[PDB]
Structures are given as structure tokens and as C-alpha cells.
Amino acid sequence: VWIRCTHSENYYSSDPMDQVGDSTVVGTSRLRDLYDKFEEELGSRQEKXXXXXXXXXXXXXXXXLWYNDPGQMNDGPLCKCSAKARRTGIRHSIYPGEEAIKPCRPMTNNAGRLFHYRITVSPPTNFLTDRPTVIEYDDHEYIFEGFSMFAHAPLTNIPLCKVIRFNIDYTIHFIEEMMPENFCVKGLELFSLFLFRDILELYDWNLKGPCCPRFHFMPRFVRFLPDGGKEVLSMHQILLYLLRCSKXXXXXXXXXXXXXXXXXXXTGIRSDVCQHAMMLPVLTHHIRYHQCLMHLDKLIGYTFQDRCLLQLAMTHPSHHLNFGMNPDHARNSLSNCGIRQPKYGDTPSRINHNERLEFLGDAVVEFLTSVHLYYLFPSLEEGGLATYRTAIVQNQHLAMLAKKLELDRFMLYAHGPDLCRESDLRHAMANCFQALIGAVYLEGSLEEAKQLFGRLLFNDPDLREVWLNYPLHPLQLQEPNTDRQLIETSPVLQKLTEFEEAIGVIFTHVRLLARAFTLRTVGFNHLTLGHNQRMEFLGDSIMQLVATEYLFIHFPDHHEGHLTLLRSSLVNNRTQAKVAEELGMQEYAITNDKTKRPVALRTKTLADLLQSFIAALYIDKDLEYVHTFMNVCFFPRLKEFILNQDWNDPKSQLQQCCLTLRTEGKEPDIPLYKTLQTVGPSHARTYTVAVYFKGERIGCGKGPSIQQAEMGAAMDALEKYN
């Protein structure tokens, strides 16, 4: 596949010694005239719910249509922040790391300055038209085909740019192909300013920064070629055609007057190029953002090997669209001069947020804080632990701590409808931080999360050495190797040996396990100092963490609410208490001395026993033993935990139970009820309704009322899961 250009009609020159700089093709003394003609003849642009339409009354065009204003949205302005809020805002097109772009060359191209890429869109659903922008040159029809982009720097490491608009997840490919010669920067700027500003009223698109822009763009007109590649039409002919044609064959063509331009459904540019130009701001924003993320990597300390993960962690749910520039200008230009195939008559994505990684990062931060505050204060009870913890996990604190990573400069916070205070911004930083540390916890090891949060906590580097390097537990401190030596003359460990054999867990320091079973009744002892009210705290923390990770990984299509629900039904009081009772932790409990005649324990107490055992397991071992434990005693029984759960609603129970099903790629739907039979007289009525979850029928009910019938159907669908 080889790329080729049309001949240079004395305009361009490929002379070796007539080149200026690292240029290949130079513009002769015949291009300046054409440029002046194009500039003087096609430069006439700069020469000349009720309250919303009322405020648009000044110089109306046609219909109600929707024209674009420099800085304002469909309803009022698109900005209501501050003066210094410009340089710290990302919607204002201010990316950290972007400086002044050195001007390339006046006319002559820049092969040694511009890196060429070809921009296509897959799949082409809104690409090919019956009336494409076709220009004829040397007795050959040259058809339009995407855009060519010239960057002032290599992309090196940038992921795929995906964006959804026409209810289709489009992919803007930017394949580095051979560079079509015979072009000039001044000409590309002429066409860009004639299209992206004049014809298409696309203001508020800062490709510079308030001098050359960030990316150059050249139209592509291909004629195709046998036994080879294809031929690209040179720029001079593009200018010549756009100049000569600006003077059912008129069907599907874009016309402009002095609104901006409209697409005649009933200049020689049709609804082909315009539609293909509305994908460019998205790609440019994407590239620039991923280019400024390299300055984020040095702030974090950890370099993400997956840009998509970092971006998704930085994405904010305030983004209703994935477009680059102002949504108003985009939709307006798409509806006024976009593509529109002939008519015969003439559900948002919540998984693209950072709420997932926030849901994970909550458990991550919780776990780090819990563990560190646990080991660094072996004398402090549960009260001070929970106090410190709650004092740290606080959202305001997490926001102020998130500012140390300059997350406010890398966040994708969009402008709201009208209300946009500091609260939304700082809160956004707070959540996005948890998303970040969640992602770091995911890709990088847990130790990376420890290092991140630890380094971010204390400003003094002397305090970090203590926080990061927490000492072993007092019951592990006394005995370097193990407590197996102490078993021989142990009173309680003899009992716990059975508990070790029944689970197959051979504890290293049995003092921990003995502590985990020491109820709040007893005080202090030789075998165990204090009760397990600390391991209840730490236990709750590690349980929440592991469960959160499991539900995050094995349910990648469930949003925040679904994961929250499933976790609430996976790790609650009655559940872990039931597990604790099933393992038989009642008999191995430690209370009083001999006052406890029967083995009657409260449900909550059993829950505390399970949590404390998991904490002791984590301390004596690691998170793997915990994960295994919950993988045998919690996770696979998730569905079961919903079946024998407390009743509330057959519909809700069936919904949550069906929420466990093998979700593919589409978000999990809710059980659909379809009425089958409506029989009976005016008095009585026997309704027969069947449940349809994602097509397949699960159970069928027959009741006197519609709600009772569908509840009967839901119950029938719940009995089938037994």
C-alpha cells in the first residue's frame, strides 16, 4: 500500500536544493497568488423555554434552527466560574504541560516537523453517503475520504479514541501512514479557518491557547488505484475547486450565506466533509489530554501502563457527552449541516464513569487507613482507631489531600447546567482521588497504594517512614518464630488446635487467633492482651476490601449501585454471622472463666467472631488466605445469600437474584413482566402474568391482581432457582 499525490502544476516544487529546512516540497511563486485570491474572494465571512429563544433575538436567520455564539451554550453562557478558574479549568482547554507551539513554515511544508497520521472512523455507519463531496481534476473523479492530521510531535504512546454519538460506540482511528506531499501550512490554515470557523460555526475550540495551532488538518480526496495504493489530490486543487464552486444535483449540499451554513435536503462542500470534521475535536482533545497525562505520571509517582485505566479513573460523571469542544456547537452543526440520509416520510452508559474505581478505592483507602492505624497503635482501642479512621477518610480531607496531586488540573470536570459552586469541584476531586487510588490498587500492587496514600498523607518525609513501615503485632513481637512452643503448656490453644484442623489452617502465632475469640467480657491475660474489638474493626475493613475487589472484577458490567447492593447482600450482619455459626465458632469463643454454662451467643457477636477471625487470619498470614476463605465461605454462595435472605419484595428479590447471572457486555437489565391472560367478569378477574428476564421466561404466576399475579410469577421464578 503506497500513497501518492497529484502532479504539481508549477505550484509546488520537489527540488532538492530549493528546500528550506527539513522540508521536502516547496511552494513556488504561483501559490501566493492563488492564496491571495482565495483569501480575498473567500473572506466575506468577517465582513458582515421562551426566554431562551427570546435571548437569541438580535440577528436571526431562519426557523427557530440553532445558531452558535462564541462562549455561550444553548441556554446562557457555558461558563460561570472565575478569573483564575481559566488556567485551572480543563473545559477552558487548558492542559498542563502545553506551551507555545513554534511556528513551522510560512508556505513550504514541514516533513521534519510534522508527523502525519490518517484519521478514519470505524464502523462507517454515518460516513458513506449517496452524495459525497467529489471534485474532478484530470478527467478523474476524486472522492472524499476522511482527514489527514499533522502533529507537531510523535504520539508514541496513545490509546484508541472511542466516542459515542449516534447511539453507536465509534472508534476514531489515527493510523500513521505515509505523508501526502504537495501541501502548505498557510493553505491548511486557510481551509481550516474557512471550514472550522466560517462554514461550521465551531468557536471555543482552542487549538492554540490564549502562532501555529496544535494539529494541522488536510482534506483527503482519493481516486483509488489498481495493483497499488491510491492517489491523494493536492491542496492547490482543493483551493481551486472550493473557489470555483463557491460561485437533484443540488441535493445534499452545504450552502452558506452571511446562522452560518445549512444542508440543502430539498461552496462545493456537501454533507460529507462536515460530518467528518465533527469528530476531529474529540480526537484532538483525546490526544492533548493523553499528552498532558505524562505530567500526571510524575505527580502520582506511578506510571500507568494502561492510559485507558487512568483516563477512566479521571473521567467524571458530569460528562453527558464524550465530545471535545462545546456540546452546543457540536449538536447544532450536526443538525444544521451534518449528514442526513433520505427518509421515506418526506439509555446512557453509567459504566464509563469512575464510580467503579471509586467504589473500589473506598475499600482501598478504608483498608490502608485501618491497617496502618491498627499496627502503629497497638495500645489504642477501637474508639481511637475509628476516630482517626473517620477523621482521615473524610471527603473534605480526601479532597485537600487530592489537591497535592493537582487532580483538579487533570480531572474531566464539565460545566453544569447553571449551578456550579466550589462544593461540586472539591467533592469531584475527593471522589476522583478514590478512583485513582483504586486504579493504582488494581494495576499496580497493593504496596503501590500503600506508598501512594502514605506519601500523600504526611508532608514531613520523616513521618512517612513510620506510617509505611508499621511494626509487627505485639503478640508476634514477643515470639520471633512462632507460638508452637507455647502450645505444650497452653490452656486454650488445645481447644483451638481442633479449630485449626477443621479448617486446615496451621496458625503461626496462635495468640492472634486466641485474641480473635476473646469476647468483650474478659480484660487482659497472658495468652492474650485485650479483646478482639480491634480485630472486629480491622476485620470489617479487610472483609469489605476483598468483597469489593471480588465484585469489581467478576462483575465488570454492573454499575456502582448494583455492586453496592450485591455487596450489601454478600457481606452483612446475618450473612457473616450465618457463616460463623456454620463453621462452629461458638464453642471456641472465650468469655468469663467458668460462668458461661451454655453456648448461647448473639447474632452480632457471631458476626464479630467471623470478622475477628478474618482479621487474625490476615495478620498471621496475608490477603490471599482471606480471599480464599471468602471464596469458599461467601462469594459462590452469593445467590444463596439472596434466596434465604429477608423478604421484602418478590420483584426486588428476583431482580437481585437475576443480577448474579452471567452478564456479557451490555448492562444488566431488570425483570420484565408481560401479562398473558386477562379473564373473568367485571367483578372478579384472574390475571396470568409471566416474567421475562432478557428474553427467556422465568416462572409464571396467576393472581387476582396484576401486582399479585406478577409477584406470584416472581415467586415462581425464585422457586426455580432452588
Partner: peptide, 23 residues
């Protein structure tokens, strides 16, 4: 009280414990 659950639990715990003994 289910002996089956603690049986499978003992199985996997023994499995992991013996897995860390092979490294």
C-alpha cells in the same frame, strides 16, 4: 452447622498452604 462447607474450606486451605510450600 454444615460439615460440607468446612470440608471444602479445609480442602482449599490445605491446597493453598501446600501451594506455598512448593515455593
Amino acid at each position: 452447622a454444615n460439615l460440607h462447607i468446612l470440608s471444602k474450606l479445609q480442602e482449599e486451605m490445605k491446597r493453598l498452604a501446600e501451594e506455598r510450600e512448593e515455593t
